[PDB]
C-alpha cells in the first residue's frame, strides 16, 4: 500500500511550549484556559527575556520551535525555573533565525551619521571585488 500525503503541519499549543511576545519577551505555557487564552510565565535570568506570571491572549504571541519536556500541568514558578535552566532555553533561543533577525535590526537602528558614511564606503570596496568575479564567470559562460 502506497500513501503520499502533502499537507500542512502546524505547531501546537501545549504545556511546555515557549511563546514569543510582542516586546521580544519569552514565556512558557503552564495551563490552558480557552481556545484564546493561556496561563504562562518565563523565569529567565536575562532581564530582556523574562516575563511575569499571568494570562496571555494568543492573538499577541508566536509559537517558537522550543518545547520543554515533561513540564507538569499547573507547575509553580519554582518548578518552572528549575526546568527552564536545566533544559537551556536561553541558549536554544539564541541559535534560532528569529533571534538573529532581531539582533540585525537592532544594530542598523543604532547607526550614527558618521557610521552611515563609513558603511557606504566599506560596501563599495567589497562591491569592487564582486563585479570583477562576476565578470570572470559570466565571460566564461
Amino acid at each position: 500500500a502506497e500513501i503520499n500525503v502533502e499537507a500542512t503541519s502546524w505547531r501546537r499549543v501545549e504545556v511546555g511550549r515557549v511563546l514569543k511576545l510582542e516586546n521580544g519577551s519569552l514565556a512558557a505555557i503552564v495551563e490552558i484556559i480557552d481556545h484564546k487564552r493561556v496561563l504562562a510565565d518565563g523565569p529567565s535570568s536575562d532581564p530582556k527575556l523574562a516575563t511575569p506570571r499571568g494570562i496571555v491572549p494568543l492573538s499577541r504571541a508566536l509559537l517558537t520551535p522550543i518545547v520543554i519536556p515533561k513540564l507538569p500541568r499547573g507547575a509553580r514558578t519554582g518548578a518552572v525555573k528549575k526546568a527552564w535552566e536545566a533544559y537551556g532555553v536561553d541558549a536554544k533561543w539564541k541559535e534560532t533565525n528569529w533571534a538573529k533577525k532581531q539582533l540585525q535590526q537592532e544594530r542598523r537602528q543604532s547607526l550614527t551619521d558618521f557610521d552611515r558614511f563609513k558603511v557606504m564606503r566599506l560596501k563599495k570596496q567589497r562591491r569592487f571585488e564582486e563585479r570583477k568575479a562576476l565578470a570572470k564567470i559570466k565571460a566564461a559562460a
Partner: protein, 173 residues
C-alpha cells in the same frame, strides 16, 4: 477592571422602642462604591421593611480574590426578565476570579438573550471544587486530559498605515 465585589453592612435607624437594631450583610458587584450603596438599598427594600431615609450604612469593604493566578471553574445562579415573564437559569464559566466570571456572564446574557443589566438578579456564585461537578459540555471539552490543538489560518498583523504591499501575505504563522 470594570467590576469589583464589595461587602456592605446596613442597619435600621435606632429608636427608643428598639435600640440596637439588627445588621444585614450583602455581597454586591459594582463598578464603584457610589453605585454599590445604591444597589444595596434596592435589594434590601425587597426583603425587609427598611428604606434609605430610615436607615444607615455601617461599613463598605473591598473583597479581593485569594489566588488570582489559579484557573477555576465557576457556577452561577440567576433570575432575569424576558419580554414576557421571568425565568431562572444556571450557567458555567472558566477563569481565575469571581469578578472575571461575573463580567463574562453579563456579556453572555446580552449576546444570547438580549438581557440588559437592569433586569438581572444574581443569586449565588460558587467555585466548583471537583472535576465531577462540571455539567455543561462546553466546559467539559476544556478539562479534557492531555489537551492540545493547532491554530490554522492565522492572519498576520499588518500596520494600517502601510497600504500597497509588494508581496502576497501568508497565513501559516
Amino acid at each position: 477592571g470594570r467590576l469589583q465585589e464589595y461587602q456592605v453592612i446596613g442597619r435600621h435607624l435606632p429608636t427608643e422602642a428598639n435600640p440596637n437594631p439588627a445588621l444585614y450583610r450583602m455581597r454586591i458587584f459594582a463598578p464603584n462604591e457610589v453605585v454599590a450603596k445604591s444597589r444595596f438599598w434596592y435589594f434590601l427594600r425587597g426583603l425587609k421593611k427598611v428604606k434609605k431615609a430610615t436607615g444607615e450604612i455601617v461599613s463598605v469593604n473591598v473583597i479581593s480574590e485569594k489566588h488570582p493566578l489559579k484557573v477555576k471553574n465557576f457556577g452561577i445562579w440567576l433570575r432575569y426578565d424576558s419580554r414576557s415573564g421571568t425565568h431562572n437559569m444556571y450557567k458555567e464559566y472558566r477563569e481565575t476570579s469571581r469578578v472575571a466570571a461575573v463580567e463574562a456572564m453579563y456579556a453572555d446574557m446580552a449576546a444570547r438573550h438580549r438581557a440588559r443589566f437592569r433586569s438581572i438578579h444574581i443569586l449565588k456564585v460558587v467555585e466548583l471544587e471537583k472535576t465531577e461537578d462540571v455539567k455543561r459540555p462546553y466546559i467539559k471539552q476544556l478539562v479534557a486530559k492531555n489537551l492540545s490543538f493547532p491554530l490554522p489560518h492565522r492572519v498576520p498583523k499588518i500596520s494600517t498605515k502601510k497600504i500597497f504591499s509588494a508581496k502576497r501575505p501568508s497565513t501559516f504563522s
